[PDB]
C-alpha cells in the first residue's frame, strides 16, 4: 500500500498473509477453513498466516495453517487477468476470535462512490523500493465503470472495477495482490493489477467479488 497508513495490530482480523518461505500475497479469510485470494497468486506450498501484524516477528496472535488445497477459478485467464480469484482450504480450521475473524460475503455489488478499505503488506513506495513489516491500510472509493474504462481502454471486463484516486499518490502495490477491499463490512474486491502503483490516471483494479459469490458458496459446499 502506497499513500496509506499503519492499520494497528490486528484491526483487519480477516487479512491473510500467504507465505511460501516469504510473503508473496495477501488474502481474506471467509470462514473457519477457507480463504479467497487472486488466482494470479497461485503456486504450491502455501501456508496461510492469520493473526498477523508484523510479518517478520512472532507477536503472539498468529495461526499458521498449511493449505490443504487451492481451486483457481475455472475461467481464469492469466493473460487478461479476467476472473482473478482463487479459493484456499486450510489443512485445519482456524480458531476465530476478535483478533482472528472472517469477512462476510456480499449479497449485492457495491457501486461507484462507496468508500472501502484496502490493506496489505505490499510496497509502499513509488520512490526507492520498500516493503513494510506491519499491515498498511488505505481507505479509497470505488470509481465509475466509465472512468475505469477511460483509464484502461480495452482491458476492463465485467469482473473488474477500479478503486482509488485518479490524482495518484494512494493505491495498492506489489505484494498487495490477493488481499481485501471491504466496503461496509463486505468483501467486494480482491487486489488484482494496475499500471505501476499510485500513478496519475492509473488506479488499482480489483476483482468484482459479488460476481463470484455463487461459485464460492457452491465450491465450499462440495470441497
Ligand atoms: P500483485 O501481485 O501484488 C500486483 N499485480 C501483479 O504484479 O501482477 C498482475 C499484473 C498484470 C499485468 C501487468 C503487471 C502486473 C499489483 C496489484 C495492484 C497494483 C496496483 N497498482 N493497484 C499493482 C500491482
Ligand atoms: Ca507476526
CSV table of C-alpha atoms and ligand atoms in Angstrom, one decimal:
chain,number,residue,atom,x,y,z
A,1,UNK,CA,0.0,0.0,0.0
A,2,UNK,CA,1.3,3.4,-1.2
A,3,UNK,CA,0.0,6.6,0.5
A,4,UNK,CA,-2.0,4.7,3.2
A,5,UNK,CA,-1.4,4.4,7.0
A,6,UNK,CA,-0.4,1.7,9.6
A,7,UNK,CA,-3.6,-0.3,10.4
A,8,UNK,CA,-2.8,-1.1,14.0
A,9,UNK,CA,-2.1,-4.7,15.2
A,10,UNK,CA,-4.8,-7.0,14.1
A,11,UNK,CA,-7.5,-4.4,13.3
A,12,UNK,CA,-8.3,-6.2,10.0
A,13,UNK,CA,-8.9,-9.6,11.6
A,14,UNK,CA,-9.8,-11.1,8.1
A,15,UNK,CA,-6.4,-10.1,6.4
A,16,UNK,CA,-4.4,-13.2,5.5
A,17,UNK,CA,-0.7,-13.5,4.5
A,18,UNK,CA,0.2,-16.1,2.0
A,19,UNK,CA,3.7,-17.4,2.7
A,20,UNK,CA,5.8,-19.9,0.9
A,21,UNK,CA,9.0,-19.2,2.8
A,22,UNK,CA,8.3,-15.4,2.3
A,23,UNK,CA,5.1,-13.4,2.0
A,24,UNK,CA,4.1,-13.3,-1.7
A,25,UNK,CA,0.4,-12.4,-1.5
A,26,UNK,CA,-2.4,-11.4,0.8
A,27,UNK,CA,-5.8,-13.0,1.2
A,28,UNK,CA,-9.1,-12.8,3.0
A,29,UNK,CA,-10.4,-15.4,5.5
A,30,UNK,CA,-14.1,-16.1,4.6
A,31,UNK,CA,-14.9,-19.0,7.1
A,32,UNK,CA,-13.1,-21.3,9.5
A,33,UNK,CA,-11.5,-23.3,6.7
A,34,UNK,CA,-11.4,-21.1,3.6
A,35,UNK,CA,-9.5,-18.1,2.2
A,36,UNK,CA,-10.2,-16.3,-1.1
A,37,UNK,CA,-7.3,-14.6,-2.9
A,38,UNK,CA,-6.3,-13.8,-6.5
A,39,UNK,CA,-5.8,-16.7,-8.9
A,40,UNK,CA,-2.6,-14.9,-10.1
A,41,UNK,CA,-1.2,-15.6,-6.7
A,42,UNK,CA,-1.4,-19.5,-7.1
A,43,UNK,CA,1.6,-21.6,-6.6
A,44,UNK,CA,2.0,-24.8,-4.4
A,45,UNK,CA,3.3,-24.8,-0.8
A,46,UNK,CA,1.2,-22.0,0.6
A,47,UNK,CA,1.0,-21.6,4.3
A,48,UNK,CA,-1.8,-19.3,5.4
A,49,UNK,CA,-0.8,-16.9,8.2
A,50,UNK,CA,-3.7,-15.5,10.2
A,51,UNK,CA,-3.3,-13.1,13.2
A,52,UNK,CA,-0.5,-11.2,11.6
A,53,UNK,CA,0.6,-7.7,12.2
A,54,UNK,CA,4.5,-7.6,11.7
A,55,UNK,CA,5.1,-10.5,9.3
A,56,UNK,CA,8.8,-10.7,10.3
A,57,UNK,CA,8.1,-11.2,14.0
A,58,UNK,CA,6.0,-13.7,16.0
A,59,UNK,CA,4.0,-11.4,18.2
A,60,UNK,CA,1.6,-13.9,19.8
A,61,UNK,CA,-1.7,-13.9,17.8
A,62,UNK,CA,-0.7,-15.9,14.8
A,63,UNK,CA,-2.2,-19.2,13.5
A,64,UNK,CA,0.0,-20.6,10.6
A,65,UNK,CA,-2.0,-23.3,8.9
A,66,UNK,CA,-0.9,-25.1,5.6
A,67,UNK,CA,-3.1,-25.1,2.6
A,68,UNK,CA,-4.8,-28.5,2.1
A,69,UNK,CA,-6.0,-27.3,-1.4
A,70,UNK,CA,-6.4,-24.4,-3.9
A,71,UNK,CA,-9.0,-24.0,-6.6
A,72,UNK,CA,-8.2,-21.4,-9.2
A,73,UNK,CA,-11.3,-20.1,-11.0
A,74,UNK,CA,-12.2,-22.3,-13.9
A,75,UNK,CA,-12.3,-19.3,-16.2
A,76,UNK,CA,-9.2,-17.6,-15.1
A,77,UNK,CA,-7.3,-16.0,-17.9
A,78,UNK,CA,-3.7,-15.1,-16.7
A,79,UNK,CA,-3.1,-13.0,-19.8
A,80,UNK,CA,-6.1,-10.7,-19.4
A,81,UNK,CA,-6.4,-11.3,-15.6
A,82,UNK,CA,-10.2,-11.8,-16.1
A,83,UNK,CA,-11.6,-13.9,-13.3
A,84,UNK,CA,-8.7,-13.3,-10.9
A,85,UNK,CA,-10.0,-15.3,-7.9
A,86,UNK,CA,-8.9,-18.5,-6.1
A,87,UNK,CA,-10.0,-20.3,-3.0
A,88,UNK,CA,-7.7,-21.8,-0.4
A,89,UNK,CA,-8.9,-24.5,2.0
A,90,UNK,CA,-6.9,-24.8,5.2
A,91,UNK,CA,-5.3,-28.0,6.5
A,92,UNK,CA,-7.0,-27.3,9.8
A,93,UNK,CA,-9.8,-24.8,10.7
A,94,UNK,CA,-8.7,-21.6,12.4
A,95,UNK,CA,-9.9,-20.6,15.9
A,96,UNK,CA,-11.9,-17.5,15.2
A,97,UNK,CA,-11.8,-14.9,18.0
A,98,UNK,CA,-11.9,-11.0,17.9
A,99,UNK,CA,-8.5,-10.7,16.5
A,100,UNK,CA,-8.9,-13.6,14.0
A,101,UNK,CA,-12.2,-13.3,12.1
A,102,UNK,CA,-13.9,-13.9,8.7
A,103,UNK,CA,-15.3,-11.2,6.5
A,104,UNK,CA,-18.8,-11.7,5.1
A,105,UNK,CA,-19.6,-12.1,1.5
A,106,UNK,CA,-21.6,-9.5,-0.5
A,107,UNK,CA,-25.3,-10.0,-1.3
A,108,UNK,CA,-25.2,-7.1,-3.7
A,109,UNK,CA,-22.4,-5.4,-5.6
A,110,UNK,CA,-21.1,-2.1,-4.3
A,111,UNK,CA,-21.4,0.9,-6.6
A,112,UNK,CA,-19.2,3.8,-7.6
A,113,UNK,CA,-18.5,6.2,-4.7
A,114,UNK,CA,-18.7,3.6,-1.9
A,115,UNK,CA,-15.6,4.0,0.2
A,116,UNK,CA,-13.8,0.8,1.1
A,117,UNK,CA,-10.6,-0.3,2.9
A,118,UNK,CA,-7.7,-1.9,1.0
A,119,UNK,CA,-5.0,-3.4,3.2
A,120,UNK,CA,-1.7,-5.4,2.6
A,121,UNK,CA,2.0,-5.7,3.2
A,122,UNK,CA,2.9,-4.7,-0.3
A,123,UNK,CA,5.3,-2.0,-1.5
A,124,UNK,CA,4.7,1.5,0.0
A,125,UNK,CA,7.0,3.5,-2.2
A,126,UNK,CA,6.7,4.8,-5.7
A,127,UNK,CA,10.2,6.1,-5.0
A,128,UNK,CA,13.0,3.8,-3.7
A,129,UNK,CA,11.6,0.3,-3.2
A,130,UNK,CA,10.5,-0.5,0.3
A,131,UNK,CA,8.5,-3.4,1.8
A,132,UNK,CA,7.0,-2.9,5.3
A,133,UNK,CA,6.6,-5.1,8.2
A,134,UNK,CA,3.2,-4.3,9.6
A,135,UNK,CA,-0.1,-4.1,7.8
A,136,UNK,CA,-0.8,-0.9,5.9
A,137,UNK,CA,-4.4,0.3,5.2
A,138,UNK,CA,-5.9,2.7,2.6
A,139,UNK,CA,-9.5,3.9,2.6
A,140,UNK,CA,-10.5,4.6,-1.0
A,141,UNK,CA,-13.5,4.9,-3.3
A,142,UNK,CA,-14.8,2.5,-6.0
A,143,UNK,CA,-14.6,4.6,-9.2
A,144,UNK,CA,-17.1,4.8,-12.1
A,145,UNK,CA,-17.1,2.0,-14.7
A,146,UNK,CA,-16.6,4.8,-17.2
A,147,UNK,CA,-13.6,6.4,-15.6
A,148,UNK,CA,-12.0,3.0,-15.1
A,149,UNK,CA,-12.5,2.2,-18.9
A,150,UNK,CA,-11.4,5.7,-19.9
A,151,UNK,CA,-8.2,4.9,-17.8
A,152,UNK,CA,-7.6,1.5,-19.3
A,153,UNK,CA,-9.2,1.4,-22.8
A,154,UNK,CA,-9.9,-2.2,-23.7
A,155,UNK,CA,-8.7,-4.0,-20.5
A,156,UNK,CA,-11.6,-3.8,-18.1
A,157,UNK,CA,-14.1,-6.7,-18.1
A,158,UNK,CA,-17.3,-7.0,-16.1
A,159,UNK,CA,-15.5,-8.8,-13.3
A,160,UNK,CA,-13.2,-5.8,-12.8
A,161,UNK,CA,-13.8,-2.5,-11.1
A,162,UNK,CA,-11.4,0.4,-10.3
A,163,UNK,CA,-10.9,1.9,-6.8
A,164,UNK,CA,-8.6,4.7,-5.9
A,165,UNK,CA,-7.8,8.3,-6.7
A,166,UNK,CA,-7.1,9.3,-10.4
A,167,UNK,CA,-4.7,12.0,-8.9
A,168,UNK,CA,-2.3,9.3,-7.9
A,169,UNK,CA,-0.5,9.0,-4.6
A,170,UNK,CA,-2.6,6.4,-2.9
A,171,UNK,CA,-3.0,2.8,-4.1
A,172,UNK,CA,-2.1,-0.8,-3.5
A,173,UNK,CA,1.2,-2.1,-5.0
A,174,UNK,CA,3.4,-5.2,-5.5
A,175,UNK,CA,2.8,-7.8,-2.8
A,176,UNK,CA,-0.7,-6.4,-2.1
A,177,UNK,CA,-2.2,-8.8,-4.6
A,178,UNK,CA,-4.9,-11.3,-3.4
A,179,UNK,CA,-5.8,-9.2,-0.4
A,180,UNK,CA,-9.0,-7.4,0.7
A,181,UNK,CA,-11.2,-4.5,-0.4
A,182,UNK,CA,-14.0,-4.4,2.1
A,183,UNK,CA,-16.8,-1.8,1.8
A,184,UNK,CA,-19.5,-1.7,4.6
A,185,UNK,CA,-18.3,-5.0,6.1
A,186,UNK,CA,-18.4,-6.9,2.8
A,187,UNK,CA,-15.5,-8.2,0.7
A,188,UNK,CA,-16.2,-6.5,-2.5
A,189,UNK,CA,-12.8,-6.6,-4.2
A,190,UNK,CA,-9.6,-8.7,-4.4
A,191,UNK,CA,-6.3,-6.8,-5.2
A,192,UNK,CA,-5.5,-7.7,-8.8
A,193,UNK,CA,-3.5,-5.4,-11.2
A,194,UNK,CA,-2.7,-1.8,-12.1
A,195,UNK,CA,-0.1,0.1,-14.1
A,196,UNK,CA,2.7,0.8,-11.8
A,197,UNK,CA,1.4,1.9,-8.3
A,198,UNK,CA,-0.1,5.3,-7.4
A,199,UNK,CA,0.4,6.9,-10.8
A,200,UNK,CA,-1.9,9.6,-12.2
A,201,UNK,CA,-5.0,8.2,-14.1
A,202,UNK,CA,-3.9,4.6,-13.5
A,203,UNK,CA,-5.9,3.4,-10.4
A,204,UNK,CA,-6.0,0.0,-8.7
A,205,UNK,CA,-8.2,-2.6,-10.5
A,206,UNK,CA,-9.9,-5.2,-8.4
A,207,UNK,CA,-11.8,-8.5,-9.0
A,208,UNK,CA,-15.5,-7.7,-8.5
A,209,UNK,CA,-16.2,-10.3,-5.8
A,210,UNK,CA,-20.0,-10.0,-5.9
A,211,UNK,CA,-19.8,-11.8,-9.3
A,212,UNK,CA,-18.4,-15.0,-7.7
A,213,UNK,CA,-20.5,-15.4,-4.5
A,214,UNK,CA,-22.4,-18.3,-6.1
A,215,UNK,CA,-19.2,-20.1,-7.3
A,216,UNK,CA,-17.6,-19.6,-3.9
A,217,UNK,CA,-20.7,-20.9,-2.0
A,218,UNK,CA,-21.0,-24.0,-4.2
A,219,UNK,CA,-17.3,-24.7,-4.0
A,220,UNK,CA,-17.2,-24.6,-0.2
A,221,UNK,CA,-20.3,-26.8,0.0
A,222,UNK,CA,-18.6,-29.5,-2.0
A,223,UNK,CA,-14.8,-29.4,-1.0
B,1,LIG,P1,0.3,-8.0,-7.0
B,1,LIG,O1,0.9,-9.3,-7.5
B,1,LIG,O2,0.9,-7.5,-5.8
B,1,LIG,C1,0.3,-6.8,-8.4
B,1,LIG,N1,-0.1,-7.4,-9.6
B,1,LIG,C2,0.9,-8.1,-10.2
B,1,LIG,O3,2.0,-7.6,-10.4
B,1,LIG,O4,0.5,-9.0,-11.3
B,1,LIG,C3,-0.5,-8.6,-12.2
B,1,LIG,C4,0.0,-7.8,-13.4
B,1,LIG,C5,-0.6,-7.9,-14.7
B,1,LIG,C6,-0.2,-7.1,-15.7
B,1,LIG,C7,0.9,-6.3,-15.6
B,1,LIG,C8,1.5,-6.2,-14.4
B,1,LIG,C9,1.1,-6.9,-13.3
B,1,LIG,C10,-0.4,-5.4,-8.2
B,1,LIG,C11,-1.5,-5.2,-7.5
B,1,LIG,C12,-2.0,-3.9,-7.5
B,1,LIG,C13,-1.4,-2.8,-8.1
B,1,LIG,C14,-1.9,-1.5,-8.1
B,1,LIG,N2,-1.2,-0.5,-8.7
B,1,LIG,N3,-3.1,-1.2,-7.5
B,1,LIG,C15,-0.2,-3.1,-8.8
B,1,LIG,C16,0.3,-4.4,-8.8
B,2,LIG,CA1,3.8,-11.8,13.1
